[PDB]
Write a protein that binds this ligand. Structure first.
Ligand SMILES: C[S@+](CC[C@H](N)C(=O)[O-])C[C@H]1O[C@@H](n2cnc3c(N)ncnc32)[C@H](O)[C@@H]1O
Length: 266
């Protein structure tokens, strides 16, 4: 078998591969599809929640690279590739945009290295986001991002994998690295008291190692002093929609996660 690489199959699911399976990608093994299937059986709207997270990723990156004028992105916990990735969105509005992707799953590097050796403004590497010091000093980071100028750091679909004991220091390190005029874009599994939210967090914790549903206020808090851009921290489908959407008529899948983008002030 030539793909996914058999040497990466330990009959254990990974976060990247399961999310890929939820989106209908082929970068996954049976253990990943089995867990996605199981999760969908217990968690209504799970796949739709992933779709909405990808759609807000696109809308947010388009806001950042176009309107906000940002040319430098650090995409933490990037995941495996989809039909619309960060650098593709960024370059569609801003041909000079530069994106550095970071993921812990080696399959992300293996797939991507292929796709991105032809792009001098896009780089990918394997690392653990819980070690900001290592990521912020990596040669791909240092050669691609000048942190003395505005940048965007993204923890899209990533915040709920940071435990209570590490989250404050980890997200704080990345906020602290940024120049005034920079942005932090995150999305997260949310606890608004709907039953599936904490059940989904449990399944993720038990099967994938980490999974923390945060209240809207706990999500907002991880933006620190940054100034939230309108509409603030809201269900992912409600974040600057480009397609009609009614906040009182959301499905269960549209209430699993929230999105927010905040700006660092001078
Ligand atoms: C794939 S899902 C979200 C993907 C993408 N950011 C999105 O929102 O569409 C979460 C991703 O975060 C990565 N991840 C979780 N914890 C990580 C960590 N501590 N260091 C690096 N990557 C991590 C997973 O491997 C996975 O690829």
């Amino acid at each position: 078998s030539v793909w996914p690489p058999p040497g990466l199959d330990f009959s254990k699911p990974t976060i990247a591969r399961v999310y890929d399976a939820l989106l209908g990608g082929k970068d996954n093994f049976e253990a990943d599809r089995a867990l996605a299937d199981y999760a969908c059986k217990h968690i209504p709207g799970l796949k739709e929640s992933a779709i909405e997270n990808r759609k807000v990723l696109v809308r947010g990156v388009r806001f950042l690279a176009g309107e906000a004028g940002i040319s430098q992105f650090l995409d933490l916990g990037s995941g495996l590739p989809t039909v619309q990735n960060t650098h593709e969105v960024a370059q569609s509005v801003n041909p000079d945009a530069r994106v550095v992707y970071v993921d812990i799953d080696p399959m992300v590097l293996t797939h991507g290295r292929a796709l991105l050796a032809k792009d001098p403004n896009t780089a990918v590497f394997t690392a653990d986001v819980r070690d900001p010091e290592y990521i912020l000093n990596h040669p791909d980071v240092r050669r691609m991002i000048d942190f003395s100028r505005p940048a965007a750091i993204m923890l899209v679909g990533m915040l709920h994998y940071l435990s209570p004991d590490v989250v404050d220091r980890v997200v704080g390190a990345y906020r602290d690295a940024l120049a005034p005029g920079s942005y932090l874009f995150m999305t997260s599994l949310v606890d608004t008291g709907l039953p599936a939210q904490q059940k989904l967090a449990r399944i993720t914790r038990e099967n994938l190692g980490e999974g923390w549903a945060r209240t809207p206020e706990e999500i907002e808090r991880q933006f620190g002093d940054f100034e939230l851009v309108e509409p603030g921290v809201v269900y992912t489908a409600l974040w600057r929609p480009d397609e009609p959407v009614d906040p009182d008529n959301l499905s269960p899948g549209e209430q699993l996660g929230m999105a927010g983008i905040g700006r660092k002030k001078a």
